[PDB]
Design a binder for this molecule. Sequence first.
Ligand SMILES: Nc1ncnc2c1ncn2[C@@H]1O[C@H](COP(=O)(O)OP(=O)(O)NP(=O)(O)O)[C@@H](O)[C@H]1O
Ligand SMILES: Nc1ncnc2c1ncn2[C@@H]1O[C@H](COP(=O)(O)OP(=O)(O)NP(=O)(O)O)[C@@H](O)[C@H]1O
Ligand SMILES: Nc1ncnc2c1ncn2[C@@H]1O[C@H](COP(=O)(O)OP(=O)(O)NP(=O)(O)O)[C@@H](O)[C@H]1O
Ligand SMILES: [Mg+2]
Lengths: 498, 503, 255
Amino acid sequence: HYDILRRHIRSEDLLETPEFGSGSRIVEEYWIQEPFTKAIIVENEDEFRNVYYALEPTVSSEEAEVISALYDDLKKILVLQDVSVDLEERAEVLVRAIEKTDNFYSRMLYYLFRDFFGYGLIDPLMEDTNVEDISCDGYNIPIFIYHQKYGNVETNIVLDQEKLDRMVLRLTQRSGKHISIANPIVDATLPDGSRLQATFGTEVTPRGSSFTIRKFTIEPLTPIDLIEKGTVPSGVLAYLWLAIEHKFSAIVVGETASGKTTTLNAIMMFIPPDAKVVSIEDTREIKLYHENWIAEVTRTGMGEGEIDMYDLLRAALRQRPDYIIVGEVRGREAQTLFQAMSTGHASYSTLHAGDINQMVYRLESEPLKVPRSMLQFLDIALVQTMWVRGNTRLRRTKEVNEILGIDPVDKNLLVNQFVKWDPKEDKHIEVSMPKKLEKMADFLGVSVQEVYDEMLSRKRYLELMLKRGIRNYKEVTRYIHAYYRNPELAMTKMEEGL
Amino acid sequence: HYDILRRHIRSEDLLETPEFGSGSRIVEEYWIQEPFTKAIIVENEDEFRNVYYALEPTVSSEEAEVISALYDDLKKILVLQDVSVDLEERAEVLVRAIEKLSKEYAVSFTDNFYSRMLYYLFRDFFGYGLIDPLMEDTNVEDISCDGYNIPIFIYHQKYGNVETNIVLDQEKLDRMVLRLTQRSGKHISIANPIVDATLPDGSRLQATFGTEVTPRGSSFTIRKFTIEPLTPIDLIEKGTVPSGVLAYLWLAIEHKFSAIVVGETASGKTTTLNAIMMFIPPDAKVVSIEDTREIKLYHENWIAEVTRTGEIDMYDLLRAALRQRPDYIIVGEVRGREAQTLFQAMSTGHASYSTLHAGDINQMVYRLESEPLKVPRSMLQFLDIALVQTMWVRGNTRLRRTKEVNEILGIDPVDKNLLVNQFVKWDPKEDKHIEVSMPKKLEKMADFLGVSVQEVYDEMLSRKRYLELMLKRGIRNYKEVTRYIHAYYRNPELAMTKMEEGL
Amino acid sequence: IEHKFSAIVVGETASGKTTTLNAIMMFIPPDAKVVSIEDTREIKLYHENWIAEVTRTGMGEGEIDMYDLLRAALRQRPDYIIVGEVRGREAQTLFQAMSTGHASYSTLHAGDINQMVYRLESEPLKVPRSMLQFLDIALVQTMWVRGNTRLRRTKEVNEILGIDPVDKNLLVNQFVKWDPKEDKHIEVSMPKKLEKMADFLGVSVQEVYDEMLSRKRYLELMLKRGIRNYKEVTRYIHAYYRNPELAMTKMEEGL
Ligand SMILES: Nc1ncnc2c1ncn2[C@@H]1O[C@H](COP(=O)(O)OP(=O)(O)NP(=O)(O)O)[C@@H](O)[C@H]1O
Ligand SMILES: Nc1ncnc2c1ncn2[C@@H]1O[C@H](COP(=O)(O)OP(=O)(O)NP(=O)(O)O)[C@@H](O)[C@H]1O
Ligand SMILES: Nc1ncnc2c1ncn2[C@@H]1O[C@H](COP(=O)(O)OP(=O)(O)NP(=O)(O)O)[C@@H](O)[C@H]1O
Ligand SMILES: [Mg+2]
């Protein structure tokens, strides 16, 4: 959208500078869509809070209706709104059509685009990858957002009745729905691939029409990342890399906000480049730099057929995939998962609990109701934690539990604890042997020492990526995919900064 | 409504002075809505009791007949009797229409009889008719009309149960019920004679039609809805909840502990929830789902969702809202299916709060676990606090009191019993709340912060002091209270100083 | 009854249950709002602020049972609730009403507190064991015959003290017992409930005990003066409620 534009423009010194009266300090400033929009994070000494200010090329009140006029005509051009047309061409017409200062030109095309190809009033928010949530509550209420770093902050964008009503139609339409007083609520998904709740009128929202947008922008923490944060030691990560390659199933358990999903997504970047993976989640959260992958998302059924995790797994496990990822088990679908395990599908997921005992309880009891005897097919179960002191915010893998199996005439769940985390020294201690490594020698058909050797090898590879500052997930997945293809060549490039 | 009327009034002094024979002595008088209505608590000393007298602008057998005459014509107009229309403009469609009928029939009334007839037309058109005065008087909390020819009884905020002078006969009462019923979107009739609805303003209605299931005639009962939200200060001042418990709750909702306030129907459950819901941190994202708009908050980043009875239910809205990233979710009252969903929101990290109809905590568990709600036992663990409201009655006094505060620790490993801790219990005897123990939830907070339990506790006392300072300074209204609380959030010490320093 | 202690009248068929209930229901405070739910009218009350609700058979319309009627009555948050006789599900709602402070009264077909407990706990009634604690008093009515000697007597006045943790459960203190050999009512324990009244009222026991003896005198006087009718009786009782002083004097001065 902006590359096609930003060239058709003439000037480059568009948009002036911000002017905030006293008590309105400027915390930070950064670009969004240079050189059009820029965002400024202002403070406000009185109310210890920061505020998000959305900057766009300032215009004249004469240029107002002027630009709103050039638009009143370009609107009656069906060949513009048509999405069937590639944006590259569509733009051209708008330009040519506009032919019928060398600075006012550019600082104008911006809008003409922001309203035909952009998202309008909220484009600055849709484009900024720091804003992961947009909340337009009601008529004449300043929009709020969730900043990647600032969190909840008020915004300089407000929409009066009509301005918002049309906004809600714009979003609703681009998402492919027809919100009306007859169907005032829409829970669809925008083209950019984002979750949009929307309400028209005031029948359900006395505070007027409204909308919310949860942007899938994430930037998933990486295995290397976990090593840096001291969350999981490099050696444990290698053990998992192997485990994951061999299809040992794992569940990440932990108190709410302790790290479960992050860790999962992190270690899910260890999946073999060619393996077919299918994921089922209630809402997108998992980012993977993997191709042969199908992502399935649950359906609310607000106004259609409700398709839950159970429905989605049952028909996915049917495509007989290699790896199966279930966002988090919160019910019935849990049975199907363990069934998938008993069958050899490398299955992974999350579970809200504090220790293996709670894990077992939740899994066995309704709603999950996973049969006691099925637990044997789970291989590893990690336990994540949050640890705090000063502003000391720590997320750690409290423990790496190896589920050995079931016992006949028992207590049942046989667990061998490999790694334990001591908080007193913030250290991970080996408190038993990694038995699973033995099951690998059996799979692979080699000796333990041999496997142990590869672990130490894979371990080195990770510590190197760390030293070389290879943090991003896209780049990390590339170097791991690398190692899978040819560990020899992979290792050498790593040691030779390439 | 009346400010509009007070405009066109065209005069004042429309009320005379009642004639209560001996064996009757005025105890107190007061405008309900001057210069039209006025309440006069009269003491029939022979029967040693009082008797609420709704006083309205006087009219003669001839006058009322004339009034009723205009009503018949004006009745033709639909606009003025249409709810979707702005009271203000249809209030003129009325005066501008009475102008017509007047000048046309070539007649000019008295400046007074106008500022009297006008009152009645607005009343029977826009207001609540015969019971409007009761529906207005801020002191009446309940209105109870037992049947044909039986005097309406009300509950006066100061005299409690009292006999009223307003009496509806069959013809009048049946209309009254149909009107109230219709006015609530619901329908009533001999086919289906019982109705449980809520009036446009929130007041809860319980009507009955004919003598079908209710001999003695049709009947109704209204439980008015206070327009101004009681605040945690109001609650400390009313002896309904200790400032300590309140401070405890402040921290709890700040730290996103999910809680449900339990109680009998009309025990003041919603009122408490709305009060403590003022402790929500300022920038957080609040989403509220209700069947009846009731909760009033001074919180900008909040979307108020409302049920559609036709069709959109709480369940739909709840699961919808849950696909976003709201910080706080308020339900108002879980009555069915969604109760499951609401307990999951808890499970997945959402600060969730709601009202529930039950008397004990035992009954809470039972009502939760069984149909229609059907919440699995393993899920209750995710509820943090459970308050219990009670409306204690002794003589001509009613006391809404937080009868008990419970903490849900967890689920016992044996028999999977709910681990609960009742740290505060009310005592009807001395009307004193008692701390049977210290909150165990304080440790969960300490960890979530990395501070010692001792450190959290002192923070509590601080907020507690802040609350009592606000009280002592007479800061009661919700907008201003919310304002001062949001402050303590932004900066505590600066907030404390300014409090004890008069600013 | 004034203090809202809930009571159930139990007894064999035709022993007097309903009569006794209706009788003692004439002790309800003149201004209190009372709602009654019955399968068929039987209760007569000389009370104004009262709503009488009657069940619907549904012969050709919508069937509305006692459950439906109570559930929406207890909703009007009344002072006193009267249920003709509990014969099922609606019994749960009643005891719920009790646990909540609604002075609730009703009848139950049974011969002794043991049968009462069984019937109430078991289906169709199925009232949860733990809820029984909210019932205050339970009277037991009887029929006694010899020659043409037709007698209806309150066999016993049982005070339900409460529940026991780790128990047998229903704690009952028997206040009065009826000896048929001499046709006399014997006190076989103290009226504990009078103590709960001192606590409610905020006075001493002796004080309450005094009022009892007072109210007792008032009744024996109405008797001596032949004030039998319910309309007239309810008037003199309503009287005493308004002003016991003035009430007592008129009584002693045949007016
Ligand atoms: N190891 C870590 N180091 C630093 N921050 C982390 C770490 N793990 C998670 N976080 C952050 O902590 C927050 C917690 O979310 P996350 O831990 O992903 O979900 P969760 O609590 O496990 N729940 P779920 O997503 O339902 O499984 C996110 O904002 C993460 O970015
Ligand atoms: N603490 C209080 N002090 C005085 N009046 C109160 C108090 N709390 C509530 N009320 C009033 O009591 C009535 C009860 O209202 P509310 O709390 O909304 O209902 P509820 O107990 O939730 N019952 P329901 O509406 O049946 O679910 C209202 O008229 C309130 O204004
Ligand atoms: N104390 C009494 N003295 C004389 N006759 C009585 C007395 N109590 C009841 N009766 C009469 O005995 C008959 C029994 O009816 P009643 O005792 O009212 O009902 P019940 O058997 O208790 N059943 P129910 O009405 O379903 O509770 C009636 O005709 C009454 O008039
Ligand atoms: Mg409520």
